[PDB]
Write a protein that binds this ligand. Structure first.
Ligand SMILES: Cc1ncc(Cc2c([C@H](C)O)sc(CCOP(=O)(O)OP(=O)(O)O)c2C)c(N)n1
Ligand SMILES: Cc1ncc(Cc2c([C@H](C)O)sc(CCOP(=O)(O)OP(=O)(O)O)c2C)c(N)n1
Ligand SMILES: Cc1ncc(Cc2c([C@H](C)O)sc(CCOP(=O)(O)OP(=O)(O)O)c2C)c(N)n1
Ligand SMILES: [Cl-]
Ligand SMILES: [Cl-]
Ligand SMILES: [Cl-]
Ligand SMILES: [Mg+2]
Ligand SMILES: [Mg+2]
Ligand SMILES: [Mg+2]
Lengths: 535, 538, 535, 141
């Protein structure tokens, strides 16, 4: 029976494709050359290379988020892998399953004690599972275990492949090992959660990151309708249940958000955090701001309330168990008025402010343009994008690490099947990774990038205006665009901005860089409310 | 709790660094690090230089440390900022460069964002790539901790990690004292010195290798004296390149494995008395590999220990070992100087033919032979480094063992920031430039004007040499010279040898702005050293 | 300030003594010689050597159990350490903190790939914390962390010491790092537990192993009085609260125990398992036999009930929190009749049966002999010892591994400060480790050992009587006693048995071996009830 | 010992390599000039050939070497101690070796010897046997 076998590298690539992976981003090196050869020759997964490892990690993260599937980031041993630590930490922080595949010395090549392994130890700190595939007999089961963990916890995993093992013959990779659930514990959990929601004077259902990652939108829309309580999304749950019978009242983003939404969440005595990342992070739900004696935290395959925890409870299982205990309903709240986005750009000779950029994007949408998914870097560009009409928003809202923007827009467009991506990024972040746009030609994509150039690390000036080190030079980004294959244009007035955005949407084939000059001291409304809130 | 010293913790640290030789602090701020950067900017204890991306902060600090054989200083913010410098720090660890990493962190009374699950993830990651760490969360203990950690960086010439909660930046502390003393076994030192001399005297073909620690610890004069008295052939490792060049018994050449001179390689690998004085031992690129030499007949002095005759003597500082050997050797007037070892390529044919790496080497060397004082060279990893091996320099700084890309431009920048006006020549390939060459946009604010020769073969060429069949090593056309103006520098794309010659002369005659020479090179054309490296792998 | 330092090995020994360790058992080897030199020269802890590593592990386990403190087992790298794996697994299984210290190659001696480290990996599977002390700067903190874990979870830990590190100078070892507790979670836990005990129709408080290990007898006696519910002990809680205002009604040992006690436990709808090991083991409380919807399991620093768990709740903290919520009481149940032990040995010419051995021991006690602590091996000797009056019973009641008996009696007597120990062991188990008695002379002890010789692996015959392999030869153990320094006597009749036991108690200075011949097919009453119960 | 450790062409045919008791140690030989055939692989000239069974390697070498009548037999290598002085002096390990060897020289067919770890093994090395079984590398008692 069966008796077939293939190269270890091929078995791994097929296992990834079997699980929904859509591409492999990476930068090779001597130790990883053999693995990249197999990837290129077999063509199991499209192979996209980038310039610098941070972008490889950010692009793989973005692709994972775009399709709620596994992302794949391939690097070489040593500097290549260490150079992707931050991007992988960001994916871990925001629950994105990036599969890190690093080449490594052959099993016979002994060691290389320059750092005396250190790389494996470092990656153990930022992934949920790891495996060094140095035994062909056990490789298939180890691949299934590690990929299975990535899918079960929606976080990065690490696979190290000695180069002499790339071509080792192995059996095909089977299904993820099962993480069975205790039916009795699950029943008890669902019973307590439901009882808690029914006894609360003000229950609130928060739809969060895991709902999207695990593709539970349909099931949760049904749960929300039956539960009958107010629905609110977290920053990473933005957009969920938009088409549901009972869409979210809004999104909680902390102090800078709608005061009515903030109060509803923070004063709830039955706060059901369905799949939420909790942290004292800027836009996240913080344990310090909610009632811990009444919160129900369903996250990381556990459910916590009243300071006690039900272990090994997958979110999907919890949702189904609650559905089994709730009668159907025909209730709806879709008769309400939609959200009011800032519109009406005054295309005149006045200088540009972040909100003008928001109005420019929103007007095209109102005029008939189908919204584009937006990839945002960290900075006022993100605070501005929150007031933009989108077809999804991808940003390091909790991790807050810079450099994600451009590479994410690139990674997303690589797997969007034709959908164009809009990227917003500040000058500081662009100096870090905006250069990756030079790869658009080879990748066959043409994202639109609005660069907020205030020749400043403005979020830092805002918190400490007396410092001079936040004053950056004026880099002529638009002028540098042609050198890396795109069409760039520097705009200084709202009129030029309006014109430049229309031109970008009308021009395909090359990335379009709109360099918007913004004076220092000028912020988006959301960042302003955020700063005032801190004071 | 201390009070009254009128000395902020951050200030005490900056002064402790300056006391030990630090010449600047490179960094990129963040909310958690703002208070620390404020103290740095306002006090000006150390010149503060910001860069665009954290990898450059780490590379520049490493380069500054290597340039002056002192401590380098790299400041970042908590989380993303710090994690983004892990690679540059690992590279400094790998090549024995004491980069002092200073990361901002949440205040001691504000907890943190447990997004990753001191036992915090960041601290645990940095402990793997540094020789000592400290979280300065106690003002009463901070002075001693700083001395211990900075002392560790100086004792082993490796990066260290300091994490400062933002509410501790301004906490009053007492002044930082001297580095605590590290153990020294004087009896072991004596026995070791005797055994080493006996082994070198009985060897049929002893060889003295002058390595990285000799440079890091400023022992060139003592080692020159030792080399003359010891009376055995002298060779340097890549990291020891240039040492003893003016001594009575200068190195016969530099050992770098199969890529180097066959005679030098033979001498080292067939030695039955190989004295590795301060050498990194590893199977990586140009390092002396345990797999190529006979460890049984090797005397390895490194990391404050000495290994020979199967055993190891602990607690023996390299400076102490050298002094002990000198005390056992009578003076000598022995001299083995002679006409230049390893001929540098010269005579560039400034014509219409395309450019090859060796032509770039000849262009640089011809200027030097015509009277130009050589510049120190910062090289990235790639054929640019293999080409630089054949360039006359005033020092060469490169990831010769770690082989991580991106070091080049930022190292040139870091080095020129502390060179007191001495211009730095950076060589870098197109793949590496796409990673960190953009840092040149900071030259104007930093007040520097490096000359950068970018080897543009539209290819990850070193990878092509290893696996020519693959298509992914074919890179696109990036017009780097055309992007120079946007970053405040002068760029020119050259295709012929005549254009190269003219461009190099113009770059040298033009200070005040960085000069970018984008040399177009066809794929498949390699420097002689890389070609030998490739043939040696066959 | 301070600025003092000492050899790493000395710092470790003092840290152990600081935590109550009373001795160090071990067998040296080339890699461990330097460490044993420091132990012998410093005399910080008495150094006792044994013949074979299993005994080193069993003796250290017994010493830990005897004084509810840390046990110390020192071995050499390789065969020495691997030969102690079973004893360490047994200590882990029965919650005994044995500190395993293994010598190892120096940090410069590279490696020894005979098994390619493997030893470290194997010990990670049977200990709660490990550390290779290869860095003098961090050694003190690592020692405190590992010893702290042994004390916090009451399970074995592993310390590997490269021989060139034995004499490395280090700072003294400080206190165990704190494992702080969330006051709010603790309050919530105590509140729910108390509420559950009050709502149960039949609450039961089981006093178990952790109560003894953590020295909480006094605090639990107070809790038991205030809670006012029936008290029962588990096998490993045998003897606890004997002098308490409300002593246990008895001990639960499963099917072979008192039917009234068994029912009380198994039908309780408020079973408070205070520090219990749960398992389908012979004498243990099994999850399969109790009501999981009503059990409250306080164990391993957690509390579980209703399928949910309160994490990081130390047993001591839980007990104090419950005491704070309970009013004092003067209730007592000490007016009841004591336990009826089998007595009245017929000192005649009839052959010996296990129960005759029980009667012999019990009669001496009734006649005025202060009871001795009993160390029992696994076999009918244990089932027989359960009906003996003791000053404590030490046996592998849950782990059920053979060989523990004699070495445990030896380890216990080494730290009993003059108290004599009675050991019961079968012929099969004696053939394994009874030979360790040859060490009594050097150790300066003289335990009394009753060897049940039925020339058979009788517990196995009982479950499968048709097999011939359980028929063992007749080894003349009593005759071999003088060769290893003890006084041996083979007895065949109840009269000889009676006489031999009196003689043993009357003779000090040499171990006393009473070899009791018992015919095959003859079992203790407890083993008989156990066997019938299975059928 | 000299012959092995100074060899510039050491063919370890099926050898365990370890720094333990009697095993051939990587620290005593020159791995650069060593050909290590073991665990179905062969390592030489810095590289390793995978999937090469020892029996296959031997056959392949035989197919490349012509027959030979070469003979290097000679009088016994390593002299076994004999001549036990059966008197009133105490016993030393070498006396036990001589007692065993004398019986063999007097006509007793040698027995295979099983040795534990300790001087018993070091003594057995000088005993005439019909095979020796002992933990010579692992050294476990
Ligand atoms: C990798 C990295 N380094 C440093 C930071 C700190 C930081 C901010 C926080 C602390 O995360 S905000 C900011 C300035 C960003 O400048 P820009 O991209 O031009 O957008 P804007 O001008 O709107 O600020 C920095 C440097 C970061 N978030 N990530
Ligand atoms: C950070 C990092 N990533 C990947 C590598 C692998 C690598 C090389 C080895 C394995 O270190 S050589 C090379 C190509 C460099 O291209 P380029 O800069 O244009 O110079 P050249 O064309 O001469 O090769 C790569 C990607 C590396 N050394 N460092
Ligand atoms: C180390 C070890 N090996 C094997 C067993 C299996 C076993 C029993 C179970 C399965 O644990 S009971 C028993 C026979 C013991 O014979 P003995 O000591 O003379 O006492 P008795 O004759 O009363 O049986 C064995 C071998 C064990 N418990 N521990
Ligand atoms: Cl979330
Ligand atoms: Cl070196
Ligand atoms: Cl128990
Ligand atoms: Mg900006
Ligand atoms: Mg190139
Ligand atoms: Mg028996």
């Amino acid at each position: 029976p069966r008796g077939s076998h293939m190269k270890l590298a091929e078995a791994l690539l097929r296992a990834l494709k079997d699980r929904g992976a859509q591409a492999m981003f990476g930068i090779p090196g001597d130790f990883a050359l053999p693995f990249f050869k197999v990837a290129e020759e077999t063509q199991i997964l499209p192979l996209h290379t980038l310039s610098h490892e941070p972008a490889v990690g950010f692009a793989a993260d973005a692709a994972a988020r775009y399709s709620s599937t596994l992302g794949v980031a391939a690097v070489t041993y040593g500097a290549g892998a260490f150079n992707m630590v931050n991007a992988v930490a960001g994916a871990y922080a925001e629950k994105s399953p990036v599969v890190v595949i690093s080449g490594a010395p052959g099993t016979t090549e002994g060691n290389a004690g320059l750092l005396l392994d250190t790389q494996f130890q470092v990656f153990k700190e930022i992934t949920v599972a790891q495996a060094r595939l140095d035994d062909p007999a056990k490789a298939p089961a180890e691949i299934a275990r590690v990929l299975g963990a990535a899918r079960a916890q929606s976080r990065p995993v690490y696979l190290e492949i000695p180069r002499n093992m790339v071509n080792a013959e192995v059996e095909p990779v089977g299904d993820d090992p099962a993480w069975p659930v205790d039916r009795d514990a699950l029943a008890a959990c669902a019973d307590e959660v439901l009882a808690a929601m029914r006894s609360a004077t003000s229950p609130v259902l928060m739809v969060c990151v895991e709902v999207r990652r695990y593709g539970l939108e349909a099931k949760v829309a049904e749960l929300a309708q039956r539960l009958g309580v107010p629905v609110v999304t977290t920053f990473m749950g933005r957009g969920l249940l938009a088409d549901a019978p009972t869409p979210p009242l809004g999104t909680y983003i902390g102090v800078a958000g709608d005061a009515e939404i903030t109060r509803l969440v923070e004063e709830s005595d039955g706060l059901f955090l369905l799949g939420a990342i909790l942290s004292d992070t800027n836009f996240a739900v913080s344990q310090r701001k909610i009632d811990l004696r009444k919160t129900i935290h369903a996250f990381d395959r556990a459910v916590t309330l009243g300071y006690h925890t039900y272990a090994d409870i997958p979110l999907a299982g919890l949702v189904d168990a609650l559905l089994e205990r709730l009668p159907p309903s025909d209730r709806t709240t879709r008769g309400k008025e939609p959200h009011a986005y800032p519109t009406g750009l005054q295309a005149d000779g006045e200088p540009i402010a972040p909100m003008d950029i928001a109005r420019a994007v929103n007007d095209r949408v109102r005029a008939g343009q189908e919204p584009l998914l937006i990839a945002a870097d960290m900075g006022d560009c993100l605070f501005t994008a929150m007031d933009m009409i989108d077809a999804g928003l991808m940003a390091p809202g909790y991790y807050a690490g810079m450099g994600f923007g451009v590479p994410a827009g690139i990674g997303a467009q690589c797997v969007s099947g034709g959908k164009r991506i809009l990227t917003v990024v500040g000058d500081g972040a662009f100096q870090m990774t905006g250069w990756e746009l030079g790869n658009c030609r080879r990748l066959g994509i043409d994202p639109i990038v609005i660069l907020f150039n205030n020749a400043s690390w403005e979020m830092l000036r805002t918190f400490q205006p007396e410092s001079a080190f936040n004053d950056l030079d004026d880099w002529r980004f638009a002028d540098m665009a042609a050198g890396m294959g795109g069409d760039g244009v520097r705009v200084r007035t709202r009129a030029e901005l309006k014109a430049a955005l229309d031109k970008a949407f009308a021009t395909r084939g090359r990335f379009q860089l709109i360099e918007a000059m913004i004076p220092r001291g000028v912020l988006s409304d959301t960042l302003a409310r955020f700063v005032q809130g801190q004071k």
